[model samples]
Target: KFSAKRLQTTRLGNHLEDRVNKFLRRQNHPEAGEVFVRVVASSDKTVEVKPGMKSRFVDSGEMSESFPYRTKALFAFEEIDGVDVCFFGMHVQEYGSDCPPPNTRRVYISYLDSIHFFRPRCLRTAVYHEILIGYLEYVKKLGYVTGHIWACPPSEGDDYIFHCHPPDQKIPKPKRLQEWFKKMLDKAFAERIIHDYKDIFKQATEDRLTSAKELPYFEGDFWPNVLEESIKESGSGSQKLYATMEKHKEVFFVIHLHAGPVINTLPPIVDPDPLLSCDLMDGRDAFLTLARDKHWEFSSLRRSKWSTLCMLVELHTQ
Candidate 1:
């Protein structure tokens, strides 16, 4: 359509988008039902048939925070079949100077936006996991050893427009990053892959580090008082707990650990085929996409769409 914005042959500006595309493609498998796919890097310069793009990024301040202590980045997007499919936008504040030792290599992820033009229900939960996990891995490489992810969903207020859908369309509420990590974490501690990880939802709530209203921000550091008894209650020693975390944090090169039960889980997805549209995909980004189809919607330099929950992350690169 003439309305589409052409983000010509996506230049593989860096490895950040390259690696992220891989994760999304892996999740593109049909096992969970298919929505889309990926493409490899190009260097020969034949233009590769405009075969769609998976991600785009532009950064200032060293492409990474640690190398220069500050980085500002904007994610371009992902495309398939010559049409851009997703736009992953975020505002990152790599805490180059605002961190203590344990949380030294930290980041605050805000204005985080994930917009896909032709998304399907089947791949909703899976794709988000891939996106976020991919982002975590990307930043981890960039030297963000510690950070917080505020995962709260979008709120209703000025500077905001909510998802508007047809009454006939009844969609399941999507799964959250916090939930998926919980199961994976369950797999971890249950299998002993990790020891001494705390549920930020639980401990922070139990002791009042954050209020119920502020509960969606699920990330934190080891509270000396909390970990003080953490070891005492575990039938192990906080001494052992601290030591294990020390070695593992440096050894594993990690993510912030926490999550609550997924009470509002997605229903079983059983679509025979992904629904396509003559109109725009009725997705979270739909409101804007359709409006922009006629160049009707306005674009802002700084904007937040939908919901986001934050996680306080601390990774030790020492």
Candidate 2:
């Protein structure tokens, strides 16, 4: 459970910068140029980037308060190999105070053109796992895991369900599910092929964007053009994926984590007519009948923070 009162400002700004640079370095082996990472703010926003560095501090105070804080801390990473990834979202800074904090951050991995030009192959199991481990290590170093992860749906109020066991609860069959997921992923990757639409676009446009003559309406499908360009750059061998996507236009997915279930058992029923009789009514009627209909009344129910908040939610829509 998360509470505003317990939120604290965290100093995780530098950790993110450090982790990003380290991750990028691991990618380029025996390469000439080095990968660089920098933190940049919007034109209107003020971010203090460390001198000679690309990262900066976005906010202060407790992690909880820092979430909705004024400053928006975002990160940008660029590799000589053309790899780029962006990090954005709230930062709750309390680490080790709780096993895992209630809040987590998000990152967007952009496609790279260099991969298609060179490797142009899908990910292998070991390599994929290695990258996955790097991601996990990055989060662990930052002192958090996604409590709940979900993808945004196209429409609202459509319940997409997942389970998050309490920290103590043993999640069932995780290893099996993980194995199955990885195998499916590996199989998909094994059949991937790379494309060079972005290269084509660049050849046609001379890599210029300012003049109308430099960039013309070739396909007139900007979305598809952008998507193909990204796939070509990422070298993920997912060029044919667009056809599959076109087939399922309504497709959307979300992933999130939350505290697992906390079971609450109900009291046993004690009524002659179990099908129809209300338990509270039966008990009250039995008491009144035994006392020959004598008057009986109850006082108020004690209110607690949990219940009061529940009432507030019930009262307010937003």
lDDT of 1 by residue, 120-196 (tens): 44655445544444445554444444345433444432112222222333322224444545554444445333333
Work out how many backbone clashes candidate 2 has: 24
Best by TM-score: 1
TM-scores, each model vs. reference = 0.39, 0.22
> How many clashes in each candidate?
21, 24
Q: Evaluate residue 275 in candidate 1 and report its C-alpha lDDT on the 0 to 100 scale.
A: 22
118-173: candidate 2 lDDT, tens digit per residue: 11122222333333333334433332322111112212321111111113322224
Q: Residue 290 deviation, candidate 2, in Å?
A: 79
Candidates in order have lDDT scores of 0.33, 0.25
Task: Give me the runs in candidate 1 sitting further than 4 Å from their true place.
Answer: 1-13, 24-71, 97-103, 119-121, 157-177, 180-318
Candidate 2: misplaced stretches above 4 Å? 1-14, 20-32, 41-72, 79-145, 151-318
TM value for model 1 = 0.39
